[PDB]
Amino acid sequence: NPLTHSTPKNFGIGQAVQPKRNLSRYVKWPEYVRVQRQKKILSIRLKVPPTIAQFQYTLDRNTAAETFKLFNKYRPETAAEKKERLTKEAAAVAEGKSKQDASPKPYAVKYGLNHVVALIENKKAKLVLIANDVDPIELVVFLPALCKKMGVPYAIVKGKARLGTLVNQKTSAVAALTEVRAEDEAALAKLVSTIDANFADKYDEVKKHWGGGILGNKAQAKMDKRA
Amino acid sequence: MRIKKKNTRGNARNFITRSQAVRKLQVSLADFRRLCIFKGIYPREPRNKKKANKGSTAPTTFYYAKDIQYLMHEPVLAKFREHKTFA
Amino acid sequence: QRKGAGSIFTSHTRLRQGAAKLRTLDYAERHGYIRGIVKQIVHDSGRGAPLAKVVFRDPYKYRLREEIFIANEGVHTGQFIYAGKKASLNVGNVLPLGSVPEGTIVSNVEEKPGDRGALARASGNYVIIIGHNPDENKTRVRLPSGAKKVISSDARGVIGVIAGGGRVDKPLLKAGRAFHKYRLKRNSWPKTR
Amino acid sequence: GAYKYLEELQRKKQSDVLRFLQRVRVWEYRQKNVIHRAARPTRPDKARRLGYKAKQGFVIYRVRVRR
Amino acid sequence: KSTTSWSTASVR
RNA sequence: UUGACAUUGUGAAGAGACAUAGUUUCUUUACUUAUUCAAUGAAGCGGAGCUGGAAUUCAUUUUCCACGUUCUAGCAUUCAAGGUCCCAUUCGGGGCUGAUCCGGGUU
RNA sequence: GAUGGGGAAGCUCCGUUUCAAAGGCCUGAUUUUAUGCAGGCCACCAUCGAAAGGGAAUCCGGUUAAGAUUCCGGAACCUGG
């Protein structure tokens, strides 16, 4: 190692050119990025009423996975299957017999907002899943109260695209299980009992307690050094 | 009449670099390499390597800008983009 | 009441050197010091004090980055100027108000820390520091007019008095010398009662 | 349908659940330009009874005017 | 001839 | 130049009204998220840890500068040389460190 | 004097780098997942505005009713490839 020397630099405060560092804290982001971030923050910092933030109490990981294991067995019928059953009934309406009564009863979820609000107050819905992120929140802000009123097993789920997956839309904002097959009665019963024990009971506080009076980072360190 | 910008015409215009070529075709390095074989378009050595690279001697591959103007049309390129969309 | 629109009551800006301003208070200026060389002292059309071309280096890129001070009486080409919090006490250095002992004299002092110099900027003038206030850091000064003001202790100011002192002793003696004096400031001469 | 509960709740404009959203959204809009495009109606009950219909060719704009 | 803005160059 | 209503929100404390069980009004003192002002080709901010220390300890940590730059009209630029651990050893390339860590605030 | 923006019921007004996602270069068997882009670097303002300001390069001789540092003869020079 005879020719190779050691010329360390002194990045100092007076003699060097400061090396490249990760300055991603001070990037001047675009306006839309700044706005979405600051809306998130301004919502974390303010006291919110108790009907908002009555969300943010969703099904935990295991129970959401278990709920979707069952709800995915009832995906509504798609375009190709629709045309195929239409071709079958097309054959049978005149040849053997069908009054739209050759193919059996269909069982699938119910996913319209007007439809599910009209399915409650009947009352036939057996379990209601309500997405927790609707941007105009006042669309769903009143569903838990009506559900508890009419005595329906509601549960609030994390994600609306997640709901839309089992309906074959992009977002769906509500879903309902109204009637299930024969092999799934025990599954649905145990699931509604689980939702009872985990959502109805774990959250007797939610009715009170305006949430969101959280301080920043610098303000918090200021108060915590003061007191 | 408009003295004329010592680094435009001649060797500097006859050839184009590999990075310039790919940036112009707007595909990728792998797709460029496959298309340059399907055609096939080979690399060239200029008679003034300093007069082409505008001042320098850095190992580089040059490609006959007219060859790549003919390569830009190439109905295979759109098939490649269609496969990307299908993916 | 006609000078407001500004058709012919602007300023004459062709021969002016530029805005005389201190450096932008960056990391080194607020944590340590930094050095520069004074390279030429020049006339500026319209002022009464001579300007000074100080050349610093760029801490963040391989470059040079030259400023324009207002020369204090005593500096000379080839001098090293120091700027920051850890600067010494010599004529020419720019220091923060909190780090100069009472009784001292500064010039071109800032008003709100980071605005680059408001008070004591004309030829000959200086401003005395009369005391501090460490708890709730503040500082008391004495402006040229005789006012006793109080400002923050992180506002900078360059040590000394402004050059060119004495400009108002020699009479003008002539309408022509007032003509040549105000020819380069604005359109105010001759006057009407 | 849920529109009866939507349009009834939209009538209590001084309740807390609404006068908090008023303050969130009036901040949010004050950053975008004076006139911009809205991705979707923000009173989908009030637009429907004025003539809106959720099919191609119906557009919603948002405009801010001085007082 | 050429009737459009972009043609396919037809010629090596 | 003054008074009023609206934009206008979060506490603490003091007194009144529920007539010794918690909802409302005047008072002072704090807050920061609204709104206001200025700068930066949003570069080193927060109080606060951590190693360094001194300083001084009344039980054990609280306040200070971060502490790589001051005889001189020189120079400072190529993912930074070194140290160390792998490749597939070939023209060399990768990893940590040199350059402490955290943060839903550019100052 | 356009754009980014902001005023005005409106013809239109302010302002010129401003509070904007304001483009243009390098390398790549980037390595494993096998027909889908990877790693980087640099920063500033459209445009108009002078036949007296700035600025690449030409001379002599002859020639017509009326043209010439321009046409003819000769001898040169600048810019780009």
Side-chain angles (χ1 to χ4, degrees):
Chain A
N1 36 4
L3 310 138
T4 325
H5 319 288
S6 307
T7 83
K9 289 189 180 179
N10 183 337
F11 294 126
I13 205 193
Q15 71 298 359
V17 177
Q18 301 312 109
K20 310 272 205 202
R21 298 193 177 98
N22 158 81
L23 303 176
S24 102
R25 197 189 169 250
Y26 318 89
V27 180
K28 188 179 193 164
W29 298 98
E31 288 194 283
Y32 84 113
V33 163
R34 254 207 316 270
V35 157
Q36 51 179 353
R37 293 193 195 200
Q38 270 172 344
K39 199 163 64 163
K40 183 81 197 315
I41 282 162
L42 175 124
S43 206
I44 267 147
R45 296 292 139 91
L46 270 58
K47 308 274 317 155
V48 321
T51 63
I52 313 171
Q54 99 159 325
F55 317 86
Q56 311 208 165
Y57 302 120
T58 80
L59 311 182
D60 36 271
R61 178 205 56 106
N62 157 242
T63 326
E66 178 45 48
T67 298
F68 275 66
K69 267 185 179 73
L70 167 84
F71 259 67
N72 280 135
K73 295 169 200 176
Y74 282 83
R75 292 176 79 101
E77 161 174 59
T78 45
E81 332 195 63
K82 194 199 173 64
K83 285 183 191 167
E84 185 50 51
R85 71 107 158 151
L86 283 171
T87 317
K88 195 265 168 157
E89 280 182 3
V93 55
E95 307 193 350
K97 189 47 158 47
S98 185
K99 293 325 291 151
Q100 311 253 6
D101 299 320
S103 159
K105 182 142 190 205
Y107 309 105
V109 316
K110 321 293 200 177
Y111 47 98
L113 195 75
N114 296 126
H115 184 200
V116 169
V117 185
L119 260 168
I120 322 176
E121 319 153 316
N122 275 168
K123 324 166 314 293
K124 230 184 177 181
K126 302 291 153 62
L127 177 75
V128 203
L129 300 174
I130 307 162
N132 90 302
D133 47 35
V134 166
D135 288 337
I137 186 53
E138 50 275 53
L139 286 139
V140 273
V141 87
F142 77 95
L143 258 153
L146 154 74
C147 282
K148 148 97 159 170
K149 205 60 183 182
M150 303 314 245
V152 190
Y154 90 92
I156 294 188
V157 192
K158 231 184 188 189
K160 63 177 180 261
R162 200 137 152 73
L163 287 180
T165 48
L166 45 86
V167 160
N168 300 304
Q169 316 280 326
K170 282 193 285 187
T171 68
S172 166
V174 276
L177 215 50
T178 325
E179 191 34 66
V180 91
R181 273 204 263 283
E183 317 130 21
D184 311 273
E185 218 72 48
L188 182 47
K190 181 52 76 55
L191 201 48
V192 67
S193 322
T194 316
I195 297 315
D196 188 19
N198 301 247
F199 201 115
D201 279 287
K202 288 196 60 183
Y203 298 121
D204 199 286
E205 50 85 6
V206 64
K207 53 157 89 152
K208 277 163 292 267
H209 312 331
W210 294 54
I214 278 170
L215 305 101
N217 180 261
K218 295 197 182 181
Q220 188 87 263
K222 203 170 176 173
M223 181 164 317
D224 275 349
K225 72 94 198 154
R226 175 126 75 115
Chain B
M1 187 260 263
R2 317 249 41 64
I3 297 185
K4 340 174 68 205
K5 293 297 150 306
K6 209 152 164 30
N7 263 336
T8 299
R9 296 165 195 75
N11 279 132
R13 177 211 291 274
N14 196 25
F15 305 92
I16 54 178
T17 327
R18 164 144 144 255
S19 319
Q20 311 188 330
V22 161
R23 168 184 323 136
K24 180 157 95 175
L25 287 191
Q26 317 182 108
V27 277
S28 51
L29 196 62
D31 302 301
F32 177 84
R33 293 180 91 211
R34 302 170 96 215
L35 271 143
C36 263
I37 294 171
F38 288 162
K39 282 319 288 185
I41 316 191
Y42 306 123
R44 298 311 166 179
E45 296 272 32
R47 272 173 176 179
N48 263 19
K49 67 202 279 170
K50 312 203 298 295
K51 199 78 96 91
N53 239 336
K54 291 154 54 180
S56 144
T57 38
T60 339
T61 93
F62 300 89
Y63 265 111
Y64 264 148
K66 283 292 222 254
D67 272 332
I68 308 210
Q69 208 54 51
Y70 180 70
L71 167 70
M72 191 179 263
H73 303 281
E74 206 54 33
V76 151
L77 212 150
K79 278 288 197 173
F80 286 8
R81 298 192 155 130
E82 292 261 337
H83 178 292
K84 181 187 194 181
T85 305
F86 158 78
Chain C
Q1 268 127 22
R2 263 166 40 189
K3 331 248 177 44
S7 38
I8 50 192
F9 309 95
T10 90
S11 199
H12 318 163
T13 195
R14 186 192 57 148
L15 288 181
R16 284 178 150 122
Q17 271 312 294
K21 283 187 184 313
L22 306 132
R23 269 178 41 91
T24 277
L25 200 134
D26 41 68
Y27 182 87
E29 267 234 47
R30 83 171 88 100
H31 278 263
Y33 65 84
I34 189 181
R35 188 178 91 179
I37 302 106
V38 47
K39 210 68 76 64
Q40 51 183 336
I41 301 160
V42 282
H43 191 59
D44 193 31
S45 147
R47 331 194 60 118
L51 307 193
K53 304 288 185 56
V54 206
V55 190
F56 301 93
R57 262 171 43 229
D58 208 17
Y60 300 137
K61 183 219 175 173
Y62 188 49
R63 207 175 134 175
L64 265 56
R65 203 161 262 258
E66 167 177 335
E67 298 272 353
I68 304 181
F69 284 20
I70 298 179
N72 281 353
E73 190 157 331
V75 316
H76 63 295
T77 55
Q79 221 187 32
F80 293 136
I81 318 286
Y82 299 95
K85 152 169 292 274
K86 293 181 177 323
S88 286
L89 199 91
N90 303 128
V91 180
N93 309 278
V94 16
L95 278 97
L97 269 201
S99 155
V100 283
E102 58 278 358
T104 195
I105 285 153
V106 306
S107 86
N108 196 17
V109 41
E110 292 198 349
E111 204 185 349
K112 260 101 62 191
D115 77 325
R116 299 200 196 157
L119 324 154
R121 257 165 81 102
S123 102
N125 283 313
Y126 64 111
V127 59
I128 327 169
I129 311 279
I130 81 163
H132 284 296
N133 162 73
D135 37 303
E136 202 288 279
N137 52 334
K138 280 292 164 83
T139 296
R140 234 196 194 217
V141 287
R142 191 192 94 89
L143 315 180
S145 45
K148 267 174 309 164
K149 217 197 180 180
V150 45
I151 55 195
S152 159
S153 268
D154 295 2
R156 289 162 303 163
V158 54
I159 297 306
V161 311
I162 303 265
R167 194 171 40 84
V168 275
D169 285 49
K170 167 162 151 171
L172 282 188
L173 276 192
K174 289 207 270 164
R177 284 190 202 182
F179 181 75
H180 293 317
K181 161 163 167 63
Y182 300 98
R183 192 192 73 214
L184 288 113
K185 286 177 185 293
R186 53 212 71 93
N187 175 15
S188 33
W189 201 85
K191 279 156 148 47
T192 39
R193 295 181 281 113
Chain D
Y3 285 130
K4 164 66 73 34
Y5 309 97
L6 256 191
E7 84 102 43
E8 189 66 18
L9 183 52
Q10 195 64 68
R11 283 198 171 162
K12 308 309 165 197
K13 289 202 218 63
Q14 285 181 12
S15 79
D16 309 340
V17 325
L18 272 193
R19 85 171 312 177
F20 157 79
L21 296 166
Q22 191 229 315
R23 277 177 48 253
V24 152
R25 287 168 185 170
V26 68
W27 175 88
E28 186 223 348
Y29 309 156
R30 206 162 30 208
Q31 328 283 315
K32 320 192 197 182
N33 308 31
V34 150
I35 287 187
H36 51 114
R37 168 144 211 261
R40 62 168 87 246
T42 188
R43 304 172 69 179
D45 58 305
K46 176 85 172 148
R48 179 96 40 72
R49 88 180 73 114
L50 295 180
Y52 184 83
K53 228 78 191 169
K55 56 182 202 177
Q56 285 152 323
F58 282 87
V59 186
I60 296 262
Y61 259 67
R62 187 172 284 150
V63 52
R64 169 219 303 165
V65 177
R66 288 235 168 182
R67 258 198 175 198
Chain E
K1 276 186 184 172
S2 213
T3 94
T4 34
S5 91
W6 202 284
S7 316
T8 79
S10 172
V11 152
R12 321 176 70 214

